Design a protein around this ligand. Sequence first.
Ligand SMILES: [Ca+2]
Lengths: 56, 223
Amino acid sequence: RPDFCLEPPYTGPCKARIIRYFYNAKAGLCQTFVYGGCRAKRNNFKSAEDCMRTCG
Amino acid sequence: IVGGYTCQENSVPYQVSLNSGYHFCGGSLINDQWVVSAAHCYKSRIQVRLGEHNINVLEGNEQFVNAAKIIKHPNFDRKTLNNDIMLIKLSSPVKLNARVATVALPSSCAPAGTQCLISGWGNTLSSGVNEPDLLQCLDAPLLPQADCEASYPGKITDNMVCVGFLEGGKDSCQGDSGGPVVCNGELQGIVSWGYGCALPDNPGVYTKVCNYVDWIQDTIAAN
Ligand SMILES: [Ca+2]
């Protein structure tokens, strides 16, 4: 699978509270995390389906 | 808000919560029909909740109003966060009272050293996650621009101001964005960004509201 799928979730410097999905390789599944609102990394999805399709 | 204290019930009447299913940002009521927040808090659909204290319990003083117009600053940069400010026009004017009041726009730019009040329902931990039910408050000073720049080399513009402590411990955090920084009864800052929360050498960075008073007034009068 792509390398960005193995990176930990990135909240970013912004201080909003936006729920996004990320692939947790250690668990082998997509989970939610708090995204700050700006400068998102690639392991950041708006849905679990898109997350699993890209990093599954 | 990390290292703060629970605000006295309805002691920050101008504070609002931006909700699109759950609380995601804060804001400030500047007049009966307009709220100011951070541009990175943009969402196509936004419900504004006023008169709040406990964000998870219906208390009876709350007013829920949908946003009719969402206007971000035309020069907002999603990468550098320069001009991180946005205006929201409500569907209908709110009823102003003790729990719901407006905050005055700046008469001028407050100098470094000015004590201010920051508030929000954001994370209260620097490490880990603890979302408060009750509105949190924090007393903190505007920091000298040179210290702000030394903390964030080459990332601070004239439209930003650092507020907090260079030793860390107290700061705004995720969930606080768009919230107010009030000094002497005037809105001088808007929670925007920072590296982590309450970390040493990295105090919160805020939008310098005194640079946008005219843009705010011109936009309000034109919409
Ligand atoms: Ca409530």
